[PDB]
Design a protein around this nucleic acid. Structure first.
Ligand code: MG
Ligand code: MG
Ligand code: MG
Ligand code: MG
Ligand code: MG
Ligand code: MG
Ligand code: MG
Ligand code: MG
Ligand code: MG
Ligand code: MG
Ligand code: MG
Ligand code: MG
Ligand code: MG
Ligand code: MG
Ligand code: MG
Ligand code: MG
Ligand code: MG
Ligand code: MG
Ligand code: MG
Ligand code: MG
Ligand code: MG
Ligand code: MG
Ligand code: MG
Ligand code: MG
Ligand code: MG
Ligand code: MG
Ligand code: MG
Ligand code: MG
Ligand code: MG
Ligand code: MG
Ligand code: MG
Ligand code: MG
Ligand code: MG
Ligand code: MG
Ligand code: MG
Ligand code: MG
Ligand code: MG
Ligand code: MG
Ligand code: MG
Ligand code: MG
Ligand code: MG
Ligand code: MG
Ligand code: MG
Ligand code: MG
Ligand code: MG
Ligand code: MG
Ligand code: MG
Ligand code: MG
Ligand code: MG
Ligand code: MG
Ligand code: MG
Ligand code: MG
Ligand code: MG
Ligand code: MG
Ligand code: MG
Ligand code: MG
Ligand code: MG
Ligand code: MG
Ligand code: MG
Ligand code: MG
Ligand code: MG
Ligand code: MG
Ligand code: MG
Ligand code: MG
Ligand code: MG
Ligand code: MG
Ligand code: MG
Ligand code: MG
Ligand code: MG
Ligand code: MG
Ligand code: MG
Ligand code: MG
Ligand code: MG
Ligand code: MG
Ligand code: MG
Ligand code: MG
Ligand code: MG
Ligand code: MG
Ligand code: MG
Ligand code: MG
Ligand code: MG
Ligand code: MG
Ligand code: MG
Ligand code: MG
Ligand code: MG
Ligand code: MG
Ligand code: MG
Ligand code: MG
Ligand code: MG
Ligand code: MG
Ligand code: MG
Ligand code: MG
Ligand code: MG
Ligand code: MG
Ligand code: MG
Ligand code: MG
Ligand code: MG
Ligand code: MG
Ligand code: MG
Ligand code: MG
Ligand code: MG
Ligand code: MG
Ligand code: MG
Ligand code: MG
Ligand code: MG
Ligand code: MG
Ligand code: MG
Ligand code: MG
Ligand code: MG
Ligand code: MG
Ligand code: MG
Ligand code: MG
Ligand code: MG
Ligand code: MG
Ligand code: MG
Ligand code: MG
Ligand code: MG
Ligand code: MG
Ligand code: MG
Ligand code: MG
Ligand code: MG
Ligand code: MG
Ligand code: MG
Ligand code: MG
Ligand code: MG
Ligand code: MG
Ligand code: MG
Ligand code: MG
Ligand code: MG
Ligand code: MG
Ligand code: MG
Ligand code: MG
Ligand code: MG
Ligand code: MG
Ligand code: MG
Ligand code: MG
Ligand code: MG
Ligand code: MG
Ligand code: MG
Ligand code: MG
Ligand code: MG
Ligand code: MG
Ligand code: MG
Ligand code: MG
Ligand code: MG
Ligand code: MG
Ligand code: MG
Ligand code: MG
Ligand code: MG
Ligand code: MG
Ligand code: MG
Ligand code: MG
Ligand code: MG
Ligand code: MG
Ligand code: MG
Ligand code: MG
Ligand code: MG
Ligand code: MG
Ligand code: MG
Ligand code: MG
Ligand code: MG
Ligand code: MG
Ligand code: MG
Ligand code: MG
Ligand code: MG
Ligand code: MG
Ligand code: MG
Ligand code: MG
Ligand code: MG
Ligand code: MG
Ligand code: MG
Ligand code: MG
Ligand code: MG
Ligand code: MG
Ligand code: MG
Ligand code: MG
Ligand code: MG
Ligand code: MG
Ligand code: MG
Ligand code: MG
Ligand code: MG
Ligand code: MG
Ligand code: MG
Ligand code: MG
Ligand code: MG
Ligand code: MG
Ligand code: MG
Ligand code: MG
Ligand code: MG
Ligand code: MG
Ligand code: MG
Ligand code: MG
Ligand code: MG
Ligand code: MG
Ligand code: MG
Ligand code: MG
Lengths: 253, 60
RNA sequence: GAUGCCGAAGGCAGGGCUAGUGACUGGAGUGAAGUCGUAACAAGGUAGCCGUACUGGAAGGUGCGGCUGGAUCAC
RNA sequence: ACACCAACGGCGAAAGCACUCUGCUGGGCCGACACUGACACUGAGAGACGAAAGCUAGGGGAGCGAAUGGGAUUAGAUACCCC
RNA sequence: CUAUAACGGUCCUAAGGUAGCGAAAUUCCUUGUCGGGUAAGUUCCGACCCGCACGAAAGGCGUAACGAUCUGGGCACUGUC
RNA sequence: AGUAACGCAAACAUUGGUGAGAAUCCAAUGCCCCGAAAACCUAAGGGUUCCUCCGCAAGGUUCGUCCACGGAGGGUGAGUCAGGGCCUAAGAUCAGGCCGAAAGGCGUAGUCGAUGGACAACAGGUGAAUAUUCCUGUACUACCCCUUGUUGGUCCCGAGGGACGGAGGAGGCUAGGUUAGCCGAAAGAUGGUUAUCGGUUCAAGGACGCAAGGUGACCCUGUUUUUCAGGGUAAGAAGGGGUAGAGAAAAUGCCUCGAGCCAAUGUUCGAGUACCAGGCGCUACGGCGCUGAAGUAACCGAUGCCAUACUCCCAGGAAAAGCUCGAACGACCUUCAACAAAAGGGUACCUGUACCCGAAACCGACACAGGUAGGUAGGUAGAGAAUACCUAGGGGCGCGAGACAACUCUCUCUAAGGAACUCGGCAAAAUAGCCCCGUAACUUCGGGAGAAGGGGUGCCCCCUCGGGGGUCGAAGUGACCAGGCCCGGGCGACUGUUUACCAAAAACACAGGUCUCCGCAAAGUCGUAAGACCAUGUAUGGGGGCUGACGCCUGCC
RNA sequence: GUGAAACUAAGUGGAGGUCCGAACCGACUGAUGUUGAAGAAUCAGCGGAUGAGUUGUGGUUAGGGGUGAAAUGCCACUCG
RNA sequence: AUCCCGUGUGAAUCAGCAAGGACCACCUUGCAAGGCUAAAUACUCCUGGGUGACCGAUAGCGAAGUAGUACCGUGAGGGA
């Protein structure tokens, strides 16, 4: 399950460093900072190298995502990491291509997938690399396919069209019990580089739209508000006309 | 544990001239205005914080 | 004579068991006659009963399952 | 959830179990002497199973439907009836 | 029998405070009344409810551990007296 | 107003000396203080304060013959120590490029940037002021020089490596220390005594070497599995070789060879006519010349070394160069040209280097009861880097002398009482270590708990490896050090955080809960824009709002 | 212990925003100080002390801003 | 009106076109959508002459001597 190897060439130290500071150096994404140093594992999301026979040597921990990751070999000797599929065991064999068996960890275009399958690691764009359903226990069913377009039900529940020529991988993503963890203490959050958050109602009127009333503030604001002055609850922020809209059918519920 | 007045501590001259030093005033436009301004008043020393890269005053 | 060991009351301390008592409060029983209703016994006027959950001033009501110690009709 | 089959029928220790199929498996009964030769019956404590409702955690949610709301009925209706 | 009101009538609203708690960090009148602790108690603990003006995620009610917390009492101890 | 004060309550004293002048300057003898510093050294900083001679106007909280003050004259020596001639992190600048009234903003290669990687030196001596720098010994890097051996080497490129956490304990060791043994000296006016006092040191480096250490697969039998003993298995460890695929090396797959390997430390050289107790002689009585005995052993024992060695954990633990290896592609250079080796000789870039640095020299306007990273870590008691008393080493606080009123402050003690004090037991006093017995309600079953409460404790002999006997004292963890506890309630679950300099809490945070947004050219945030963050992430994820562990719940409009 | 499992002494193990306590970080109470020895200290006590720890060096964020476990706190004795 | 600009439409060549303070007629005046040009005018970090009902060391320049010095400030800056 978890045993540390030496470092394969896939593990580097190069990275953005200030978390949540942009160019201007300002904090943009709040609450980050602190927390253990990490190294970047170079995942292979594309899986674009076709028609060679890959073998899972080990299963390893990754700090960066909550899934697991597998070191896989080839006969050619190239080594990649892949996301760990759910139920896959060391010694297993995987392959990507067009005409391929359908089993755990194999990767194929959506032209060749039998309907009803459970998929992860889904490209929305040809050769761009896999994007959708990359987290622990995440999975998406391929419900129907018609014309040049295939239909999925994403782990958010949202049903959406994508291209039939985009690669994807069978099997759900491993390490399913990760959200069953209970951190138990403050320190355990801080280890993840997630700093403490101050409730709006608490800060002074200059600092935030629910500002100090005398004793304890109900929010008098006629509405719950962002730090920046927008309605906090149920105001849809999706760009009205965004290009994706023809593709999206039912919205997550 | 140290008094408020202690704002100026012992700090490596290297670090200071990497802040107020000469070669830094030369970078920005506003700095060049600085140096024209000081030359106008005609001060004996243009950059107070400065430092030899190597020499008797050198910080390693 | 002195002294060591063991030594009863006496002292302190926490325990176990029981006696009495206590502002207030929960129900039980008997009071012809009071109030509110009419749940049960006839198909008791929505069939009844058992377990159980929710709710109702109160007897209760409904749900889910079970049984006939159910009438009417089927024989 | 499984019409007809369904029956005063079958199996199960009881609870229960029924569209169809296949696989793993528990018993029951019957006919033979093939064999052991009383190894039996019950059971304090103890164990396992145990309708429905209920609860914890995660899913799922069409119909039905406690609670709840409206409409009536009624002296009243926190019920029967309806949505 | 004095009392109180499970019960009914009426008014008005979008609807009229349920569980639980309650003289409270909330109680004005007020040192409420009762019980306890003290020789004596405006504080303290338990309870009553007549909640000026508790109340259910501006959470309600419990709660072991914890606190240079706030608040009452007791033994030891002392120039605090 | 000739008033307050003269900057801690470590403490001075006397005899000489210099001098016009001495509580204050020098020396001697005592006494006292620090000793996880008030000691020695190094980073930063300061900038000549360092040393010598002269001076005593001002400075110095008094004095002053003195000085961190003033005047003159000196002083810092490196192939190896620290930086640069090497490499990259955060970060910075950024050719071209994108955007922008201008100034400029973003950003790629590049280039900067140590607090990190890489890389070679130690002992003794001299010494008014420097010493891993100068001198004498042995060392070591990098170049050049010759001999020999090969013919292609060099860069670009492909690779291996460099290269990495926390916690825990067990080893194996040294550094230090203590006691013996050896050697030398000793009479220190006392009742006794030599039981006393000193010495017993040596580095980097080079050769060797490694078990009772640590690691080296499985199976059977026993030793508690372990340290072990017999057998067997056939790569089964460091470590090597071969092959195969587009395939040099590498990675990867198959085949094969190897029972040892690891590294602190240790032995030997270095290393003795070094160093040194004393001994002899001179005294400008400051210091100096001369000769030198022994130089081993045992037991304590690290927080240092092996060591990124193990075992466990989740929060999963830098990059690049030097270094090792290597075909094709490109560029350049080519014969006494280049590269490869073991000897031998030779050769040796800048800058820092004084002094102070738990400070009268830095930072606090002061010669200010303060702040300031790192290194080294002796004795007796002690669990200890606490405390107490000491060594090495350094100091006696830059005003004294008296007298001994009130009063204020820092402290000791107080008859009888014991919270009567007071807003309030505020402040004091009390308790305390170790071993033994004992230990409640309540509970989330972890706790509560060192609950409470009790006993024992010194010094001698005797027994077993704790028990008995004696004996002092008013008192035995006799000093220092070192918990007061119990019963209730409110608030907040908890450790945490906070108003630098009047508030540390019941405020904030929190694990947990729940609502809403967001399908990746995401939502959100920052920018005029380019773009940046979010994220090299992808709904078990990212925003935002309220509440705040766990338990029971969360009603109506 | 049963056939599987549960349950319970034992040893080993060495978890912990565990405990006591120096260094170190703080700043709870008192006393002194108030033309201070000091523009926030000394004295005696006091809290944390393997962590949401402390600190060094070198960096980042800048005023229609920044940062904030949120006090209008902090941004060179200056901060609605 | 004249003049000059963003977005959009968009003419006429001298029998034309523009101006004459909405606009139209008539007359008068002029020839946009290409450039360049001296003098009279503004000023004093200064240079050379001249004058002063200007100062005379608290004045006159901040500065009659180390003056943008000493000193203060991290720095911009203050400044005898
Ligand atoms: Mg790595
Ligand atoms: Mg590597
Ligand atoms: Mg920047
Ligand atoms: Mg939260
Ligand atoms: Mg919060
Ligand atoms: Mg506030
Ligand atoms: Mg902000
Ligand atoms: Mg506002
Ligand atoms: Mg408000
Ligand atoms: Mg209020
Ligand atoms: Mg200066
Ligand atoms: Mg007795
Ligand atoms: Mg008793
Ligand atoms: Mg009653
Ligand atoms: Mg009754
Ligand atoms: Mg009666
Ligand atoms: Mg009835
Ligand atoms: Mg009935
Ligand atoms: Mg009946
Ligand atoms: Mg009902
Ligand atoms: Mg109903
Ligand atoms: Mg029924
Ligand atoms: Mg039967
Ligand atoms: Mg059925
Ligand atoms: Mg069968
Ligand atoms: Mg027989
Ligand atoms: Mg029985
Ligand atoms: Mg059961
Ligand atoms: Mg059920
Ligand atoms: Mg319920
Ligand atoms: Mg459920
Ligand atoms: Mg429904
Ligand atoms: Mg219905
Ligand atoms: Mg109704
Ligand atoms: Mg509704
Ligand atoms: Mg009605
Ligand atoms: Mg009456
Ligand atoms: Mg009514
Ligand atoms: Mg009524
Ligand atoms: Mg009515
Ligand atoms: Mg109405
Ligand atoms: Mg309504
Ligand atoms: Mg209504
Ligand atoms: Mg009520
Ligand atoms: Mg009720
Ligand atoms: Mg009550
Ligand atoms: Mg009262
Ligand atoms: Mg309350
Ligand atoms: Mg009230
Ligand atoms: Mg009152
Ligand atoms: Mg009484
Ligand atoms: Mg009373
Ligand atoms: Mg009182
Ligand atoms: Mg009360
Ligand atoms: Mg109210
Ligand atoms: Mg409230
Ligand atoms: Mg509310
Ligand atoms: Mg609350
Ligand atoms: Mg409590
Ligand atoms: Mg605390
Ligand atoms: Mg006692
Ligand atoms: Mg007194
Ligand atoms: Mg006078
Ligand atoms: Mg006077
Ligand atoms: Mg006087
Ligand atoms: Mg005086
Ligand atoms: Mg004074
Ligand atoms: Mg003094
Ligand atoms: Mg001492
Ligand atoms: Mg000193
Ligand atoms: Mg020194
Ligand atoms: Mg230095
Ligand atoms: Mg000088
Ligand atoms: Mg001197
Ligand atoms: Mg003088
Ligand atoms: Mg003087
Ligand atoms: Mg003289
Ligand atoms: Mg001098
Ligand atoms: Mg960089
Ligand atoms: Mg730039
Ligand atoms: Mg450019
Ligand atoms: Mg770059
Ligand atoms: Mg450099
Ligand atoms: Mg360095
Ligand atoms: Mg070096
Ligand atoms: Mg170098
Ligand atoms: Mg010296
Ligand atoms: Mg030397
Ligand atoms: Mg030398
Ligand atoms: Mg030598
Ligand atoms: Mg060499
Ligand atoms: Mg390379
Ligand atoms: Mg490192
Ligand atoms: Mg050890
Ligand atoms: Mg030794
Ligand atoms: Mg001895
Ligand atoms: Mg002897
Ligand atoms: Mg004698
Ligand atoms: Mg001796
Ligand atoms: Mg050696
Ligand atoms: Mg050699
Ligand atoms: Mg061995
Ligand atoms: Mg090869
Ligand atoms: Mg080959
Ligand atoms: Mg190989
Ligand atoms: Mg030993
Ligand atoms: Mg330690
Ligand atoms: Mg250390
Ligand atoms: Mg490790
Ligand atoms: Mg070539
Ligand atoms: Mg070679
Ligand atoms: Mg030197
Ligand atoms: Mg030196
Ligand atoms: Mg002094
Ligand atoms: Mg001082
Ligand atoms: Mg000091
Ligand atoms: Mg010691
Ligand atoms: Mg002790
Ligand atoms: Mg000892
Ligand atoms: Mg000490
Ligand atoms: Mg001494
Ligand atoms: Mg005196
Ligand atoms: Mg006196
Ligand atoms: Mg007394
Ligand atoms: Mg007495
Ligand atoms: Mg007494
Ligand atoms: Mg008493
Ligand atoms: Mg009292
Ligand atoms: Mg009193
Ligand atoms: Mg009194
Ligand atoms: Mg006290
Ligand atoms: Mg005391
Ligand atoms: Mg006493
Ligand atoms: Mg004791
Ligand atoms: Mg004592
Ligand atoms: Mg016991
Ligand atoms: Mg209990
Ligand atoms: Mg316990
Ligand atoms: Mg308690
Ligand atoms: Mg105990
Ligand atoms: Mg005790
Ligand atoms: Mg207790
Ligand atoms: Mg005792
Ligand atoms: Mg005792
Ligand atoms: Mg005794
Ligand atoms: Mg005897
Ligand atoms: Mg005895
Ligand atoms: Mg005695
Ligand atoms: Mg005794
Ligand atoms: Mg104490
Ligand atoms: Mg203690
Ligand atoms: Mg309490
Ligand atoms: Mg209560
Ligand atoms: Mg109260
Ligand atoms: Mg708290
Ligand atoms: Mg604690
Ligand atoms: Mg802080
Ligand atoms: Mg404060
Ligand atoms: Mg603070
Ligand atoms: Mg506090
Ligand atoms: Mg706060
Ligand atoms: Mg976006
Ligand atoms: Mg979510
Ligand atoms: Mg969130
Ligand atoms: Mg709250
Ligand atoms: Mg709650
Ligand atoms: Mg509970
Ligand atoms: Mg142990
Ligand atoms: Mg702790
Ligand atoms: Mg203790
Ligand atoms: Mg305070
Ligand atoms: Mg203190
Ligand atoms: Mg402490
Ligand atoms: Mg304490
Ligand atoms: Mg404590
Ligand atoms: Mg502690
Ligand atoms: Mg820990
Ligand atoms: Mg750090
Ligand atoms: Mg700090
Ligand atoms: Mg803060
Ligand atoms: Mg300033
Ligand atoms: Mg400030
Ligand atoms: Mg303020
Ligand atoms: Mg015109
Ligand atoms: Mg005009
Ligand atoms: Mg016009
Ligand atoms: Mg314009
Ligand atoms: Mg035209
Ligand atoms: Mg004209
Ligand atoms: Mg024209
Ligand atoms: Mg025009
Ligand atoms: Mg023109
Ligand atoms: Mg022009
Ligand atoms: Mg004058
Ligand atoms: Mg003047
Ligand atoms: Mg004059």
């Amino acid at each position: 399950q978890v045993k540390s190897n030496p470092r394969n060439n896939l593990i580097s130290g190069q990275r953005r460093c200030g978390k949540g500071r942009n160019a201007r150096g300002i904090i943009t994404a709040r609450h980050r900072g602190g927390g253990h140093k990490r190294l970047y594992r170079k995942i292979d999301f594309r899986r674009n190298e076709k028609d060679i026979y890959g073998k899972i040597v080990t299963i390893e921990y990754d700090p960066n995502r909550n899934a697991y990751i597998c070191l896989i070999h080839y006969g050619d000797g190239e080594k990649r990491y892949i996301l760990h599929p759910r139920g896959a065991i060391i010694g297993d064999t995987i392959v990507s291509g067009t005409e391929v068996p359908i089993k755990m960890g194999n990767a194929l275009p959506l032209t060749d997938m039998p309907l009803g399958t459970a998929i992860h690691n889904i490209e929305i764009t040809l050769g761009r690399g896999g994007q959708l359903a990359r987290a622990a226990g995440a999975v998406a069913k391929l419900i129907a396919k018609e014309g040049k377009s295939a239909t999925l039900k994403l782990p958010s529940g949202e049903v959406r069209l994508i291209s039939k020529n985009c690669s994807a991988t069978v099997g759900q993503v491993g390490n399913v019990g990760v959200n069953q963890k209970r951190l138990g203490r403050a320190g355990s959050k801080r280890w993840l580089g997630k700093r403490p958050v101050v409730r709006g109602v608490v800060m002074n009127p200059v600092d935030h739209p629910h500002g100090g009333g005398e004793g304890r503030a109900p929010i008098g604001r006629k509405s719950p508000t962002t730090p920046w002055g927008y309605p906090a609850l149920g105001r849809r922020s999706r760009k009205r006309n965004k290009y994706s809209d023809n593709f999206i059918i039912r919205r997550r519920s | 544990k140290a008094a408020l007045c202690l704002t100026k501590r012992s700090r490596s001259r290297k670090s200071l001239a990497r802040t107020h030093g000469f070669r830094l005033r030369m970078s920005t436009t506003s700095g060049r205005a600085l140096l024209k301004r000081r030359r106008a008043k005609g001060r004996k020393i243009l950059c107070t914080k400065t430092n030899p890269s190597s020499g008797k005053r050198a910080s390693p």
